[PDB]
Coordinates of C-alpha atoms and ligand atoms in Angstrom, one line a residue:
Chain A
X1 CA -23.4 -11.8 22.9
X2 CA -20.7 -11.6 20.0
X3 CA -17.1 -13.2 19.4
X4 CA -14.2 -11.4 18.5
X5 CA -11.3 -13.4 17.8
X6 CA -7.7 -12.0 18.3
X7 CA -4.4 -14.5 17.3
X8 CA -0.7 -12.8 17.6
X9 CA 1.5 -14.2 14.7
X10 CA 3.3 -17.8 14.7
X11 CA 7.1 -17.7 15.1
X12 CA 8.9 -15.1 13.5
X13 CA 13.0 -15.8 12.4
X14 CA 13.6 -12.8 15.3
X15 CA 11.6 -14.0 17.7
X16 CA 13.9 -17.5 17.6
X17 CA 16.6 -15.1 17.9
X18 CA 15.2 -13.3 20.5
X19 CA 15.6 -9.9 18.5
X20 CA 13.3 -6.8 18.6
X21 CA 11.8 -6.6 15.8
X22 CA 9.3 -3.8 15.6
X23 CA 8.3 -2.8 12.1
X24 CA 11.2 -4.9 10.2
X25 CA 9.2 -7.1 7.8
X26 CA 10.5 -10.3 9.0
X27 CA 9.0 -13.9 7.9
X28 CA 7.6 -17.1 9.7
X29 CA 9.9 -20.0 10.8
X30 CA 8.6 -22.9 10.1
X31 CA 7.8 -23.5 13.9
X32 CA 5.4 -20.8 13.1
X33 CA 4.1 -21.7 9.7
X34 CA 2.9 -25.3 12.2
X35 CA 1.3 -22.5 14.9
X36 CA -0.7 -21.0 12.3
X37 CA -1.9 -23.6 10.4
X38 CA -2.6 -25.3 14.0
X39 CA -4.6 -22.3 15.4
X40 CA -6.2 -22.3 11.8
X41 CA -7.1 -26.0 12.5
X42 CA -8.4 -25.6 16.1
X43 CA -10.7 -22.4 14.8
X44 CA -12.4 -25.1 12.3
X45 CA -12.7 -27.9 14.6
X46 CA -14.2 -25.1 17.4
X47 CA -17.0 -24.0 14.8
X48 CA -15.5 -20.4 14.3
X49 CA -16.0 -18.9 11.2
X50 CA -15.4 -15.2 9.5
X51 CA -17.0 -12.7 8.0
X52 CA -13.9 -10.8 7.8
X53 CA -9.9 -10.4 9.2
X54 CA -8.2 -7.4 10.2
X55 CA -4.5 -7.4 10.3
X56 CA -1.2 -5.6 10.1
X57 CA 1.2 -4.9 6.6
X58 CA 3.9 -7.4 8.2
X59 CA 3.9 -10.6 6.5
X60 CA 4.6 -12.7 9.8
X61 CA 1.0 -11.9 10.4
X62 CA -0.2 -11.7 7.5
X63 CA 1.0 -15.5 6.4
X64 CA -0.4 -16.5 9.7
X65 CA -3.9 -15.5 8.8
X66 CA -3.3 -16.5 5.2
X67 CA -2.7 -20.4 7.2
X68 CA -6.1 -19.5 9.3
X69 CA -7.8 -19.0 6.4
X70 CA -6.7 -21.7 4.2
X71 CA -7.3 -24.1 7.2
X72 CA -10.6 -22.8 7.8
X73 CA -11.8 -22.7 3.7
X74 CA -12.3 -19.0 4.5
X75 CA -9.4 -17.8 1.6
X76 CA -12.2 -15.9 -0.5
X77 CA -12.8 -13.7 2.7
X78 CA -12.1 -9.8 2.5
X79 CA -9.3 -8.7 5.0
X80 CA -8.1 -4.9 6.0
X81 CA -4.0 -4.8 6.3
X82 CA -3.7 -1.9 8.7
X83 CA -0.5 0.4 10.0
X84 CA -2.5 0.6 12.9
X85 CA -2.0 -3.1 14.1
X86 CA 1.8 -3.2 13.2
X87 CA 3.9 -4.6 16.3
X88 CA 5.6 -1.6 18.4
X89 CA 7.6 0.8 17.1
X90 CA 11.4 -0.4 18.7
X91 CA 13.4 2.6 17.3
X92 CA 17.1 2.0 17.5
X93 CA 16.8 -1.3 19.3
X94 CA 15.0 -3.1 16.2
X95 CA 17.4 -6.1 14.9
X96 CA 19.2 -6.0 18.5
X97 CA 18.8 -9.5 20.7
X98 CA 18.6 -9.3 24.5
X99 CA 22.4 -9.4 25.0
X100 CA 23.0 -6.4 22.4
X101 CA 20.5 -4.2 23.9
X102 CA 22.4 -4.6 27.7
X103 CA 25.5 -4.3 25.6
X104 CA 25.1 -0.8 24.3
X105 CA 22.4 1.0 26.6
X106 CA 23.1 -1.0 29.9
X107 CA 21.0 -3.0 32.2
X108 CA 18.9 0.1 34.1
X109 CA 18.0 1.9 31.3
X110 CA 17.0 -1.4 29.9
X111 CA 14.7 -2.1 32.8
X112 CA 13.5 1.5 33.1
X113 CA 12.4 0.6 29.2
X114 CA 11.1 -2.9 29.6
X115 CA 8.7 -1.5 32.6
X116 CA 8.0 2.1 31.7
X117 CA 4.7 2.4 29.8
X118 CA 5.6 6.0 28.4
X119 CA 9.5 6.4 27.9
X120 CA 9.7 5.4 24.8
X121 CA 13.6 4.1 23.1
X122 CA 16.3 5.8 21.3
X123 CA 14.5 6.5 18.1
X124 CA 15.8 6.2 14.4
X125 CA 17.5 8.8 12.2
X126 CA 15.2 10.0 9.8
X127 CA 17.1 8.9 7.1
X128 CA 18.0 4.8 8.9
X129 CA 17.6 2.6 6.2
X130 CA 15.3 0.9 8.7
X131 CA 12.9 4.4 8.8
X132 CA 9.0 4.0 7.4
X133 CA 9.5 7.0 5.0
X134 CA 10.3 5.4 1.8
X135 CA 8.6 2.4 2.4
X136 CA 5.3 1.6 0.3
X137 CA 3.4 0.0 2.9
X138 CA 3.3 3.7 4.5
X139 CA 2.4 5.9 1.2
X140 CA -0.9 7.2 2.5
X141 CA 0.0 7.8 6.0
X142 CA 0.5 11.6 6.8
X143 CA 4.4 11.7 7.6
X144 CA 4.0 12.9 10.8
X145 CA 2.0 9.9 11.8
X146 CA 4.9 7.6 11.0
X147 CA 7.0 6.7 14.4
X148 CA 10.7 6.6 14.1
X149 CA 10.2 5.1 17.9
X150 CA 7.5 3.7 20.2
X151 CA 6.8 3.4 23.9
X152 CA 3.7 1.3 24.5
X153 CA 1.5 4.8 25.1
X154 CA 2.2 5.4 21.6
X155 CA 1.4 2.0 20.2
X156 CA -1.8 1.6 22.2
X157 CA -2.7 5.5 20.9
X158 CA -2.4 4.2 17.1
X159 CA -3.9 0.9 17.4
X160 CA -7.3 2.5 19.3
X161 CA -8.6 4.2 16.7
X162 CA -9.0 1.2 14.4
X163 CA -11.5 0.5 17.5
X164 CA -14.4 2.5 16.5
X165 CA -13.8 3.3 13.4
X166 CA -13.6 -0.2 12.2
X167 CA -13.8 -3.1 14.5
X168 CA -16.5 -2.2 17.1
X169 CA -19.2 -1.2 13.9
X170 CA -18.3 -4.4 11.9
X171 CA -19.0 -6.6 15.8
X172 CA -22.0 -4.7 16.5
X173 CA -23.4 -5.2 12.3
X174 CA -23.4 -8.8 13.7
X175 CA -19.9 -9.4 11.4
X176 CA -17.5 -12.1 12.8
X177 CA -14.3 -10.7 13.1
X178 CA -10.6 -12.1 13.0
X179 CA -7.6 -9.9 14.0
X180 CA -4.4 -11.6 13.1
X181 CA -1.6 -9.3 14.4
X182 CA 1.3 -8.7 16.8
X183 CA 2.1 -8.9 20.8
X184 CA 1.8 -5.3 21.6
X185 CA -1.1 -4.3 19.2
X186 CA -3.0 -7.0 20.6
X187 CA -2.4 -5.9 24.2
X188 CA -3.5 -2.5 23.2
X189 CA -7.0 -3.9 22.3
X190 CA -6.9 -6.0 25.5
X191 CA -5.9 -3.1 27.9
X192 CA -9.1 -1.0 26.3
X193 CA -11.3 -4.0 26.4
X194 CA -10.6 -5.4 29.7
X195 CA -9.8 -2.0 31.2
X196 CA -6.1 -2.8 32.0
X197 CA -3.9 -0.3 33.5
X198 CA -0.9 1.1 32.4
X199 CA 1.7 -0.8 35.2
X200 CA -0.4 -4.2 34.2
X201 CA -0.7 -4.3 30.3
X202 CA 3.5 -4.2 30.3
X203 CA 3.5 -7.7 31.6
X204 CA 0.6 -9.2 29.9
X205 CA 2.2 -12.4 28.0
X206 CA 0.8 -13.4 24.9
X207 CA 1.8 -17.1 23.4
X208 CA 2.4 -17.0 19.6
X209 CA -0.6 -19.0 17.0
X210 CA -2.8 -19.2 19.5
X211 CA -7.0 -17.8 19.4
X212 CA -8.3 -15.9 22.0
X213 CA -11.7 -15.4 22.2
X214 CA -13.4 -13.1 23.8
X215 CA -17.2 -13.0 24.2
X216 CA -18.8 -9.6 24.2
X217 CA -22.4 -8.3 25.6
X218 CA -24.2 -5.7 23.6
X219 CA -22.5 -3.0 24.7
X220 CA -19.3 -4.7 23.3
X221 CA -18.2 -5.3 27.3
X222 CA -15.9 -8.6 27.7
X223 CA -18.4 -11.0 29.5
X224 CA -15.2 -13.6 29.3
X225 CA -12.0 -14.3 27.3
X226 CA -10.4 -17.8 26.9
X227 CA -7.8 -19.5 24.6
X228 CA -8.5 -22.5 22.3
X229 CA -6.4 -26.0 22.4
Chain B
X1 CA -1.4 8.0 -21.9
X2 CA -0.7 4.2 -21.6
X3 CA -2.2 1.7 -19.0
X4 CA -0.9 -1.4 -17.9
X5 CA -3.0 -4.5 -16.9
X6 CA -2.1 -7.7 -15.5
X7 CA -4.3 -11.1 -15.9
X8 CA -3.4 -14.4 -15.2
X9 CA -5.1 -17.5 -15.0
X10 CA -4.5 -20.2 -12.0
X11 CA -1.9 -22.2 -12.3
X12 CA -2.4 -26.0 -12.6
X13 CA -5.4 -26.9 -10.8
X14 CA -6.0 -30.9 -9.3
X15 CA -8.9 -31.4 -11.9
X16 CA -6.7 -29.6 -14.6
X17 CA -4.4 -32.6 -13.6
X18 CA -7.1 -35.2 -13.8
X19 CA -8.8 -33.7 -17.0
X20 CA -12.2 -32.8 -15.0
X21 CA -14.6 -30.0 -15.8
X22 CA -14.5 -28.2 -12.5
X23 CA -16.4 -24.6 -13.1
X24 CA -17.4 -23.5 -9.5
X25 CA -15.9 -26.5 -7.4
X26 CA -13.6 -25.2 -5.2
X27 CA -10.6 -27.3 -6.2
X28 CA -6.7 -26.4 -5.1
X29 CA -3.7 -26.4 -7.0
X30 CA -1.3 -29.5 -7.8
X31 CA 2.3 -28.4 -6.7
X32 CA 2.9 -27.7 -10.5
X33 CA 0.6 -25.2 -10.1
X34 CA 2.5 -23.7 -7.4
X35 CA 5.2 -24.1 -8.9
X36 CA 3.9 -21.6 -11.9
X37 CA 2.3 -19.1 -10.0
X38 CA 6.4 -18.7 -8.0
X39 CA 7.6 -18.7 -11.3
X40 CA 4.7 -15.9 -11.9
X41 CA 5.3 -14.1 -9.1
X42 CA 9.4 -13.9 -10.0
X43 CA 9.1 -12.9 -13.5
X44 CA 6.6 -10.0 -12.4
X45 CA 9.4 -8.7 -9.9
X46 CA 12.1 -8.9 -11.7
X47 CA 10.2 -7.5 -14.7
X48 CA 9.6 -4.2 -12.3
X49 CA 5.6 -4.2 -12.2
X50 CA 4.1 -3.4 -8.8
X51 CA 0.4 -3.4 -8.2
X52 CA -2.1 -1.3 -6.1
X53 CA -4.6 -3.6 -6.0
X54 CA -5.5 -7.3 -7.0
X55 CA -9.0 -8.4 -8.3
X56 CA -10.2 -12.6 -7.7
X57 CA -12.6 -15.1 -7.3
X58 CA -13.5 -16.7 -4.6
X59 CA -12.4 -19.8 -5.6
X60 CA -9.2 -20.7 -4.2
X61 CA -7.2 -22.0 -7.1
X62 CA -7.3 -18.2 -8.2
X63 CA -7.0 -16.6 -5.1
X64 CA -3.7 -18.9 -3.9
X65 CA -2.1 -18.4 -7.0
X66 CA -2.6 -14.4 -6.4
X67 CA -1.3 -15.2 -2.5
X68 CA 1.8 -16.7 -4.2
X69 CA 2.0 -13.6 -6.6
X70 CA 2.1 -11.8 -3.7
X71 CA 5.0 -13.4 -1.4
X72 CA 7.4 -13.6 -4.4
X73 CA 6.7 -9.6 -5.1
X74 CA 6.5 -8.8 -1.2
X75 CA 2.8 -7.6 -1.8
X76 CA 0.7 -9.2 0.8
X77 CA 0.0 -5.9 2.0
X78 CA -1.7 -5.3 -0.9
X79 CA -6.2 -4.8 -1.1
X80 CA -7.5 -7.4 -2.6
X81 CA -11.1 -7.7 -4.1
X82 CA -12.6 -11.3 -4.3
X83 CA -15.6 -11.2 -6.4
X84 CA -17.8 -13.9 -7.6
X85 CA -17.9 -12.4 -10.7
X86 CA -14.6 -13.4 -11.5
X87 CA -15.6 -17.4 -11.0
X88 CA -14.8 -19.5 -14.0
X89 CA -17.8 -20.1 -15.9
X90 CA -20.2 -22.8 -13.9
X91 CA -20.2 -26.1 -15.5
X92 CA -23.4 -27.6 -14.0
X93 CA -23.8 -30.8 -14.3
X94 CA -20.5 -31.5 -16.1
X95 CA -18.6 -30.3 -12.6
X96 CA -16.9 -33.3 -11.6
X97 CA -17.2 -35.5 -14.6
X98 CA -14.5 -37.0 -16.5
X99 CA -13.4 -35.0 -19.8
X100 CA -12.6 -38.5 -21.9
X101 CA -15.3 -40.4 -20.0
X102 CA -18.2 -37.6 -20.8
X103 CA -16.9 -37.6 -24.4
X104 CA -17.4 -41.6 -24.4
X105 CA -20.5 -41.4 -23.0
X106 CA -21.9 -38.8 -25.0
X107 CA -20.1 -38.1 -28.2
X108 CA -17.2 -35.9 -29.3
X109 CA -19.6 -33.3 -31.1
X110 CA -22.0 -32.9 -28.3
X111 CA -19.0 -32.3 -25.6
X112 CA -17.6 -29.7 -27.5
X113 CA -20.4 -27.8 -28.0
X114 CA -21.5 -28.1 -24.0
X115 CA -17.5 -27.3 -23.6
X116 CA -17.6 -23.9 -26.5
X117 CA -20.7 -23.2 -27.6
X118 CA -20.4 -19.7 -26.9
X119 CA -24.8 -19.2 -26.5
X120 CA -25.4 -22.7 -25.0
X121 CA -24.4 -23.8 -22.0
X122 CA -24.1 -27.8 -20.4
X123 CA -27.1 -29.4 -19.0
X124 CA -27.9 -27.7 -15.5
X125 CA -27.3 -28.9 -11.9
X126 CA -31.0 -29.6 -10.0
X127 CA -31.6 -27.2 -7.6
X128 CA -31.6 -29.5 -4.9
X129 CA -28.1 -31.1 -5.5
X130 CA -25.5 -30.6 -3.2
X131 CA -23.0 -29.1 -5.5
X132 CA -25.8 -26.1 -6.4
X133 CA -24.6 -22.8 -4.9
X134 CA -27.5 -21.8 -2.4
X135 CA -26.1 -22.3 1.0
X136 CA -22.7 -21.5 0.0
X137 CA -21.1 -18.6 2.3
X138 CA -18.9 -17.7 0.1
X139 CA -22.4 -16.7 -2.2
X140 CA -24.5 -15.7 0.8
X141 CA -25.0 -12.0 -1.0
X142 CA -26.3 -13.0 -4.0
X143 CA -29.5 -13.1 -4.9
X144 CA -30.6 -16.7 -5.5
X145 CA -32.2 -15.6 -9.0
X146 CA -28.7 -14.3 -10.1
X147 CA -26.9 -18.2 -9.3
X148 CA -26.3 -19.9 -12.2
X149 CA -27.0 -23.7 -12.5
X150 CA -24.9 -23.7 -15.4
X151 CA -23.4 -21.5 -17.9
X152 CA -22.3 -20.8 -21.2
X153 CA -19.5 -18.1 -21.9
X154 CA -22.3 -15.8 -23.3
X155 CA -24.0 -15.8 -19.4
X156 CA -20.0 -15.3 -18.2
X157 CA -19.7 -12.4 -20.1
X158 CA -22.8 -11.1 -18.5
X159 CA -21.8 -11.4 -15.0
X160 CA -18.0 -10.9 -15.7
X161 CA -18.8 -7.3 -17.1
X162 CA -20.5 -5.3 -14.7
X163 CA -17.1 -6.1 -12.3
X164 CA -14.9 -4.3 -15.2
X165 CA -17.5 -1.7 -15.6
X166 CA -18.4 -0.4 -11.8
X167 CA -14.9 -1.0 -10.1
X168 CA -11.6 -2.8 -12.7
X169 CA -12.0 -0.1 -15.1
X170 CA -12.7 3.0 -12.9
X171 CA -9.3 1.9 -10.7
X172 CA -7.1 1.5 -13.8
X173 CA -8.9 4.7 -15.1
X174 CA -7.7 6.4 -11.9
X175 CA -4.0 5.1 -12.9
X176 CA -4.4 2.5 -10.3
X177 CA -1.7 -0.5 -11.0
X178 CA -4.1 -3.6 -11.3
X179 CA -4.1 -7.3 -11.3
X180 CA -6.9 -9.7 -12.3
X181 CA -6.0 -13.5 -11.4
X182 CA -8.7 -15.6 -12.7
X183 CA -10.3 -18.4 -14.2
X184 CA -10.0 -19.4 -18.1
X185 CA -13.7 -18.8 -19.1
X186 CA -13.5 -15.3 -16.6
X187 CA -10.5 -14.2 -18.4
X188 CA -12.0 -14.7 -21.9
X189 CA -15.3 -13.6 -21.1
X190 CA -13.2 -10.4 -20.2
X191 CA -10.9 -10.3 -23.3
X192 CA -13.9 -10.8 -25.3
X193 CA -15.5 -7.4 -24.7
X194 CA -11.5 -6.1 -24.4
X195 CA -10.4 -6.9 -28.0
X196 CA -13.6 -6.9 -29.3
X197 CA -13.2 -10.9 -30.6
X198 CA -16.8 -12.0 -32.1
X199 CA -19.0 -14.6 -30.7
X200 CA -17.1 -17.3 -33.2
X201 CA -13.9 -16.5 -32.9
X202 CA -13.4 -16.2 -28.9
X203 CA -13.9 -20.2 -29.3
X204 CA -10.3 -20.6 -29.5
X205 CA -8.7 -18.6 -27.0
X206 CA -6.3 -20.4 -25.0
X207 CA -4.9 -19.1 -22.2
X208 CA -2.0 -20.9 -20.2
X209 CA -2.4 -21.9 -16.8
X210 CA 0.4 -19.3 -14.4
X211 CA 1.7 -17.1 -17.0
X212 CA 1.3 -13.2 -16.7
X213 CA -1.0 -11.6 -19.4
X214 CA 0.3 -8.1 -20.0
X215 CA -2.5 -5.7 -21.3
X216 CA -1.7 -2.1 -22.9
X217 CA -4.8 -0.3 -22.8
X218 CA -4.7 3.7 -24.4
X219 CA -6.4 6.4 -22.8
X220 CA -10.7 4.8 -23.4
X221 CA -9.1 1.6 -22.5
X222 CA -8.9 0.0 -25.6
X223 CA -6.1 -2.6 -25.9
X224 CA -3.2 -1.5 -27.9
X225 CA -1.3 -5.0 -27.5
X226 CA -1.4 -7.7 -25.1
X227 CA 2.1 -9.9 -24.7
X228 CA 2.9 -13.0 -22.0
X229 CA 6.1 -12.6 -19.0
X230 CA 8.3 -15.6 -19.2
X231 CA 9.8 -18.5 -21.7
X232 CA 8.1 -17.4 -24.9
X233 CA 9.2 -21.0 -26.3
X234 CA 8.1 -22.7 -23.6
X235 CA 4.6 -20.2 -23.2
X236 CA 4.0 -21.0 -27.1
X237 CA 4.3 -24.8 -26.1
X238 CA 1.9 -24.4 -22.8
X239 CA -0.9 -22.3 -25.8
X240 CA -0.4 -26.0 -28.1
X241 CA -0.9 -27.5 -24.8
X242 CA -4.1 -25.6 -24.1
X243 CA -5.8 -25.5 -27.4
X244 CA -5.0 -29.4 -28.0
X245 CA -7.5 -29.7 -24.4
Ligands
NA301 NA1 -20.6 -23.7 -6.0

């Protein structure tokens, strides 16, 4: 039996404005700054403790671990900031809100999108201000790696590999693990670990600043999953 | 070629505040000290450095003033490598006590030796007292031999160096842009062996609490100059501040 601990990011200013966001690097409100620090609270009173965090190079995850850990006296810890758990790739839709997105591209294709696991959205211009290619985050990444657009196939294809090389040896060395990322790289994890399907994982809803748990047998199965508070 | 190098110390810590020797007690920062490391944070952006990589304690005064570094440059992407190594020096039994009322108790002349004697350090925690390292997580890779009960800058040095040796120095070697944010004893432990300062004269190195300590090192890494980001008035009256403690 080992814990893994998953936690999706507190509020972000676009998620209170309903906007795709995707891999613009936006902040906490302070709704979310409270999530954090309360999900950092309810790990401590729980008895959870970490070895170690894995997370994304987006600061609205990043700050919500950085509350974890300073509720949890676990500041001193060392953490992994991976491409690999960034949020989906949105394309051309990141910075639109619900209303926008109808607006320009219509309410089909917006369905079509919203339930299609492997059509991915209009994707940036390489040269978008809002393109990876310049941005530091992304200097070591082979180019071609870099999305200029995501559908869900694709986000689940770059956050698996972080699996085994990285996550599934530091659970099995008998580490306690934290990930402290995004909607859609979490359900990536949780569609390989619980063995999701491709129609299912689309809808899976996952609450801002809360912990999931899940509880893993020796072969790193789910044996159950719960959140805390 | 030329090498850049980054230190800072903490910014104001709670027991900085209440003039308390603190050593490895895991003390926060006041909101001044906040306050400083922003201000640190600003002036590094502004002042165009970037950094590949950040090197703390575990201690939490050090490591939130790096966090705030961070935020105000839009580096919390960055690695970061929290060592031990870089604790401030252990104060044993001093670590909690009253600056003033230790100095009352046991003369001026005695607490400044157990404060800057460079080769002798304060009277020891007991093993057994809940303040004493063993069980600490944060520790839990250490061999118990290797945990200090107390220290003197000498025994810092020691344990500071082998950090700049096997890891610091090989990154900024390999032209990696580094920081180092640390403790006051860590820092000078390090600047010792840096500058070459002798056992005597390290004594009255005063470095200010939040301030960015600029190191130009040539191509073996010896330090060309070293120069503080910010105020200069007002970092020449935080040094009085300092040395005057
Ligand atoms: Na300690």
């Amino acid at each position: 039996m080992y814990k893994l601990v998953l936690i999706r990011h507190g509020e972000s200013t676009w998620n209170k404005e309903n906007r795709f966001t995707g891999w613009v690097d936006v902040d906490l409100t302070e709704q979310g700054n409270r999530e954090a620090r309360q999900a950092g609270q309810l790990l401590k009173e729980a008895g959870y403790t970490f070895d170690i965090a894995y997370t994304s190079v987006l600061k609205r995850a990043i700050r919500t671990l950085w509350h974890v850990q300073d509720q949890m006296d676990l500041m001193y810890v060392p953490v992994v900031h991976s491409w690999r758990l960034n949020e989906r790739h949105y394309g051309a839709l990141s910075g639109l809100n619900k209303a926008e997105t109808a607006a320009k591209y219509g309410d089909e294709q917006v369905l079509v999108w919203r339930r299609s696991y492997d059509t991915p959205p209009p994707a940036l211009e390489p040269g978008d201000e809002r393109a990876p290619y310049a941005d530091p985050r992304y200097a070591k990444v082979p180019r071609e790696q870099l999305p200029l657009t995501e559908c869900l196939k694709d986000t689940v294809a770059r956050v698996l590999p972080l699996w085994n090389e990285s996550i599934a040896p530091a659970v099995k060395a008998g580490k306690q693990v934290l990930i402290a990322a995004h909607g859609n790289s979490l359900r990536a994890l949780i569609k390989y670990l619980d063995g999701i399907s491709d129609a299912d994982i689309v809808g899976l809803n996952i609450p801002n600043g809360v912990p999931l748990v899940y509880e893993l047998d020796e072969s790193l199965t789910p044996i159950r999953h719960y959140y805390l508070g």
